Structure 1
Amino acid sequence: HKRRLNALGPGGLSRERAGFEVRDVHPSHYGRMCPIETPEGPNIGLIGSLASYGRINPFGFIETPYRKVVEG
């Protein structure tokens, strides 16, 4: 409950404003939002848990760590 991110709220994507595109997963939700757990009810894909290693940017974006690889 603490970590969940909700797209529903004031000045945002409401229940009836939902579409096919927003709900589905995106190639960018990798290490920033787990694609598996979401409510399986009508509000499918409008709620999502934060990734395991996720972190917040001061602006409000989500970052993820990556190990640095050099010369193979």
Structure 2
Amino acid sequence: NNPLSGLTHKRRLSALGPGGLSRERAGLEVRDVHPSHYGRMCPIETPEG
């Protein structure tokens, strides 16, 4: 619905799927912003659902 939702939908680093961990199996700790995200993953742009 906008050029951003076109772009930033890519460059998406998902945690779920085959080989990924399901939400209920996805516990509290994994949701955290690891120090190893600095520069790698955006530490702020995450879904709020």
TM-score in terms of structure 1 length: 0.52
Where does structure 1 differ by over 3 angstroms across 4 or more consecutive aligned residues? none
C-alpha RMSD of the superposition: 7.0
Work out which structure has the larger RCO, using CA pairs closer than 8 Å and 6 or more positions apart in sequence: 1
Between structures 1 and 2, the one with greater helix share: 2
Partner of 1:64: none
- Are residue 33 (structure 1) and residue 37 (structure 2) matched? no
Answer with 1 or 2: which has the greater Rg.
1
Deviation at 1:14, TM superposition (A): 1.2
Deviations 1:27-71 (A, max 9, x none): 11100001001000xxxxxxxxxxxxxxxxxxxxxxxxxxxxxxx
Q: Is there any run of 5+ residues in structure 1 with no aligned partner, and where?
A: 41-71
SS of 2:29 mapped into structure 1: helix
* Offset at residue 25 of structure 1 (A): 0.6
